[PDB]
Amino acid sequence: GKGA
């Protein structure tokens, strides 16, 4: 996921 985005920012993971």
Epitope: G1, K2, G3, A4
Partner: antibody
Framework: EESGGRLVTPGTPLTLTCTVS????????MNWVRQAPGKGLEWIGD?????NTYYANWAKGRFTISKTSTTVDLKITSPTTEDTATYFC???????????????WGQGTLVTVSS | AIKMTQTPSSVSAAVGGTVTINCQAS??????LAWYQQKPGQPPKLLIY???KLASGVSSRFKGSGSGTEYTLTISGVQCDDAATYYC????????????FGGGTEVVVKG
């Protein structure tokens, strides 16, 4: 032969074709952005590589974004005089930590909705 | 809804000076943030991606910084070629967005 502008009478649907090719990468969207006279950039929506489309809340129900082969369209479903604007398409990309931005932009189309 | 807020609305800088313009997000966008330069009659040009990285061919006079909700763009050694309107944009989500772009900051260069 592309003029760079359009004249559409209110209520007649207008379809714009993006000159940037569709996403090759999975984490990539094609986007449509308007700029009304004297105003800032207003994101309209995007289309994902799984086919899903998103619209800015004001834009919900006023546009449809679609893909045909490797070409992305924007359909203004019932134009009003408030849709007079320059329209751009733009492509972005990202991974799990970096947003790579809208790196590729098409040229603007100068749309006027008028009777 | 993630609101993007740019301040100031307009700023002036002498040639050779330094300006800093700000971009605030209403929620943490995890540095999924891009900056653009637009001159009249042109499409916007990507300047900075992932909050702090120089897009292809962009002058290193441009510096992006920040994290969480607060981001900045700094132009060092301002040149007349930098006169433009600058926009920030969140690339964190496409859902429940009123505008992904901030409202823009006009940069006037004093020659």
């Amino acid at each position: 032969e592309e003029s760079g502008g359009r004249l559409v009478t209110p209520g007649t649907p207008l379809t714009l074709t993006c000159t940037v090719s569709a996403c090759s990468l999975y984490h990539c969207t094609m986007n449509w952005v308007r700029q009304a006279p004297g105003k800032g950039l207003e994101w309209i929506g995007d289309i994902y590589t799984d086919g899903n489309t998103y619209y800015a809340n004001w834009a919900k129900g006023r546009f449809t974004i679609s893909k045909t082969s490797t070409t992305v369209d924007l359909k203004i479903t019932s134009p009003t005089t408030e849709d007079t604007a320059t329209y751009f398409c733009a492509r972005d990309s990202w991974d799990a930590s970096s947003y790579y931005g809208l790196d590729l932009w098409g040229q603007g189309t100068l749309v006027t909705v008028s009777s | 809804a993630i609101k993007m807020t740019q301040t100031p609305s307009s700023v002036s800088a002498a040639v050779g000076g330094t300006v800093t313009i700000n971009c605030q997000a209403s929620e943490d966008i995890k540095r999924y943030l891009a900056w653009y330069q637009q001159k009249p009659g042109q499409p916007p040009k990507l300047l900075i991606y992932a909050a702090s990285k120089l897009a292809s061919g962009v002058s290193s006079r441009f510096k992006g910084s920040g994290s969480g909700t607060e981001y900045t763009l700094t132009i060092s050694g301002v040149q007349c070629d930098d006169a433009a309107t600058y926009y920030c944009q969140q690339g964190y989500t496409s859902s429940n967005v009123n505008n992904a772009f901030g409202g823009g900051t006009e940069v006037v260069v004093k020659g």
